[PDB]
Amino acid sequence: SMSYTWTGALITPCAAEESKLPINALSNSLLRHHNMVYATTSRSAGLRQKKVTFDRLQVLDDHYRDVLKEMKAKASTVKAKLLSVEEACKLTPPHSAKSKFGYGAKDVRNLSSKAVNHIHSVWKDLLEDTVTPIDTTIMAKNEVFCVQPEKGGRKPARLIVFPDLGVRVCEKMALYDVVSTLPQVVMGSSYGFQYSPGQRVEFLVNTWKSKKNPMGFSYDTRCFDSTVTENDIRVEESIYQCCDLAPEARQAIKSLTERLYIGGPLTNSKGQNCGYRRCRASGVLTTSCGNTLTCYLKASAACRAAKLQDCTMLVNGDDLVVICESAGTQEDAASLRVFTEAMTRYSAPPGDPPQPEYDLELITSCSSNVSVAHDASGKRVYYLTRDPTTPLARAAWETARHTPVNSWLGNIIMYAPTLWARMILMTHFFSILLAQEQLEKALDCQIYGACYSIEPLDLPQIIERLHGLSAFSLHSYSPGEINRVASCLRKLGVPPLRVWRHRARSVRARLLSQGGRAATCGKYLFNWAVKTKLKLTPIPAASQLDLSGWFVA
Numbered sequence: 001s002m003s004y005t006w007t008g009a010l011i012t013p014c015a016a017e018e019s020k021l022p023i024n025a026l027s028n029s030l031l032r033h034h035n036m037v038y039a040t041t042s043r044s045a046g047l048r049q050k051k052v053t054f055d056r057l058q059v060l061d062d063h064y065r066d067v068l069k070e071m072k073a074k075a076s077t078v079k080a081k082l083l084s085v086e087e088a089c090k091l092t093p094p095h096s097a098k099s100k101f102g103y104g105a106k107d108v109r110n111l112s113s114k115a116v117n118h119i120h121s122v123w124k125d126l127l128e129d130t131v132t133p134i135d136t137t138i139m140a141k142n143e144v145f146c147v148q149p150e151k152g153g154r155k156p157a158r159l160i161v162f163p164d165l166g167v168r169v170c171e172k173m174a175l176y177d178v179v180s181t182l183p184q185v186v187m188g189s190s191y192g193f194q195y196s197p198g199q200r201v202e203f204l205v206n207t208w209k210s211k212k213n214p215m216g217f218s219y220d221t222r223c224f225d226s227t228v229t230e231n232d233i234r235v236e237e238s239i240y241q242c243c244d245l246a247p248e249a250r251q252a253i254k255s256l257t258e259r260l261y262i263g264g265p266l267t268n269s270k271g272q273n274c275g276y277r278r279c280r281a282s283g284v285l286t287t288s289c290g291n292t293l294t295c296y297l298k299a300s301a302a303c304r305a306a307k308l309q310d311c312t313m314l315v316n317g318d319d320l321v322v323i324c325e326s327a328g329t330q331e332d333a334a335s336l337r338v339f340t341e342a343m344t345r346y347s348a349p350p351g352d353p354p355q356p357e358y359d360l361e362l363i364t365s366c367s368s369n370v371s372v373a374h375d376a377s378g379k380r381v382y383y384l385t386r387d388p389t390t391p392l393a394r395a396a397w398e399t400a401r402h403t404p405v406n407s408w409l410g411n412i413i414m415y416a417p418t419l420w421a422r423m424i425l426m427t428h429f430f431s432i433l434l435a436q437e438q439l440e441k442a443l444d445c446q447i448y449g450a451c452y453s454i455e456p457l458d459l460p461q462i463i464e465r466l467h468g469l470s471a472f473s474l475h476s477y478s479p480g481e482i483n484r485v486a487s488c489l490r491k492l493g494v495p496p497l498r499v500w501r502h503r504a505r506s507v508r509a510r511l512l513s514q515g516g517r518a519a520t521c522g523k524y525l526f527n528w529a530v531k532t533k534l535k536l537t538p539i540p541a542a543s544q545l546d547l548s549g550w551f552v553a
């Protein structure tokens with residue numbers, strides 16, 4: 001079936017959409033080439049519609065069936081609980097889109113009677129009706145990028161699809177505990193979301209080291225969400241139903257699958273019918289868990305089809321990276337084409353065709369590659385980095401305009417051991433927070449679908465917990481990583497690393513003068529900036545840390 005059909009009514013904005021970086025004093029000190037930075041608007045939604053609209057052909061085989069049987073057997077060991085309305089209300093993110101039935105997220109979290117009893121009515125309707133498609137809103141997403149003269153051109157807006165707030169709370173009732181617990185049982189060490197960056201780089205490196213003769217590849221599915229078929233979503237459902245579930249959870253999971261997850265009508269911000277979806281919606285509770293299960297099932301079956309030896313999968317939503325034993329040069333190239341043919345029959349055709357790699361640092365996965373530095377002892381330490389272009393473009397944008405979501409903060413947390421997050425992002429934003437006197441103010445950040453409220457003053461213990469103490473002493477980064485950063489700063493008109501070192505010495509001194517947590521920030525986050533280093537010891541609060549958040553679905 002077609003992933004989408006369209007009526008021709010437009011995907012419309014609801015807020016005023018800005019596309020260009022504005023004139024700013026603080027922003028210009030980050031990057032000068034402001035004209036290289038753009039934000040996607042609804043005006044490019046038509047171009048995205050074309051990319052994501054296509055017929056899916058899907059043919060399944062015994063390898064696919066065998067893998068599924070094994071997954072269902074694991075899933076049969078999981079017991080999940082049905083949350084009450086009130087419990088699911090408390091798990092709703094603070095800034096979630098308001099209901100069209102006259103209450104918003106703040107009312108849901110407060111357990112407002114109008115909100116609670118509406119959700120009860122939505123639940124009752126899911127129990128009685130397993131068929132009628134549930135309405136969804138389609139919106140163009142506004143995201144910031146930098147122009148790439150080498151790439152094809154400017155990226156079109158992504159499209160998001162989400163049901164009403166009351167339906168979103170019912171999803172948590174039925175499925176929050178399942179999406180929380182089932183994937184790690186079914187997929188074990190292949191399940192990507194159980195890992196911090198320290199733990200994911202450790203798993204990738206040790207998986208690579210464990211092979212007699214390693215080969216790996218990333219596999220990039222073209223428009224993964226659109227390749228997910230109604231059958232895939234029902235197969236997903238059949239996995240979930242293997243859990244030990246309350247009878248009302250079983251019924252609501254069936255209804256949510258048939259009425260929402262497999263597809264339904266799309267409504268724009270003006271309330272016009274835009275069309276119909278028969279693939280994955282980006283804004284439902286099961287999208288990360290379902291995409292990870294589906295990608296793992298297809299990949300695992302395809303590994304058996306291609307006869308890859310000892311193939312270790314690492315799956316994070318639609319992100320797939322596979323590390324296996326090489327069968328030799330020619331045999332690996334052939335086997336990866338057969339892997340790709342099997343993924344294609346399963347309706348997961350590649351964007352870029354995959355290629356075997358024999359150096360772990362050459363694989364890109366979760367937009368990131370493994371790189372090497374040295375800790376305070378001189379020991380080799382592996383960590384994940386990425387091209388800093390997009391983080392820096394978005395950082396420039398968030399400096400100039402007020403944004404509800406702070407990509408700079410999520411990038412500091414996920415890329416803390418990197419040369420660029422330490423030298424530029426930490427120095428630049430701590431300088432801003434000091435001058436605004438906002439060091440204590442909690443900020444929202446979103447990381448791969450989970451939302452957190454983070455005070456910048458707690459970054460040292462958060463980084464230690466996610467990365468280890470070495471994240472504050474890394475030095476002697478690789479020439480290729482230094483060159484990539486240096487080159488990106490010249491391209492964007494960002495001051496060179498030597499300028500940041502000087503700005504960081506000043507930020508660091510001013511933090512130390514404040515004592516308390518600010519001084520701990522100056523001591524740990526900026527020990528790299530000073531000639532004579534302080535002795536950095538494990539932070540006490542790094543053990544006792546609430547690293548939990550909310551799903552934004």
Ligand SMILES: O=C(NCc1ccc(OC(F)(F)F)c(F)c1)[C@H]1CN(c2nc3nc(C4CC4)ncc3s2)CCN1S(=O)(=O)c1ccc(C(F)(F)F)cc1
Pocket residue numbers: 179180183192193194195196197198200201288289290316366368384385413414415447448449450452454462466546547548549
């Ligand atoms: O995405 C994550 N881990 C995977 C990952 C991805 C890219 C990586 O590489 C890169 F980018 F680092 F290079 C990398 F290494 C590691 C994030 C988010 N999480 C999530 N748990 C989920 N669980 C689900 C379940 C429903 C299916 N869905 C979605 C999410 S998102 C929990 C685990 N992490 S995390 O341990 O890194 C983290 C915990 C707490 C904070 C805090 F400090 F903010 F609190 C900040 C980060």
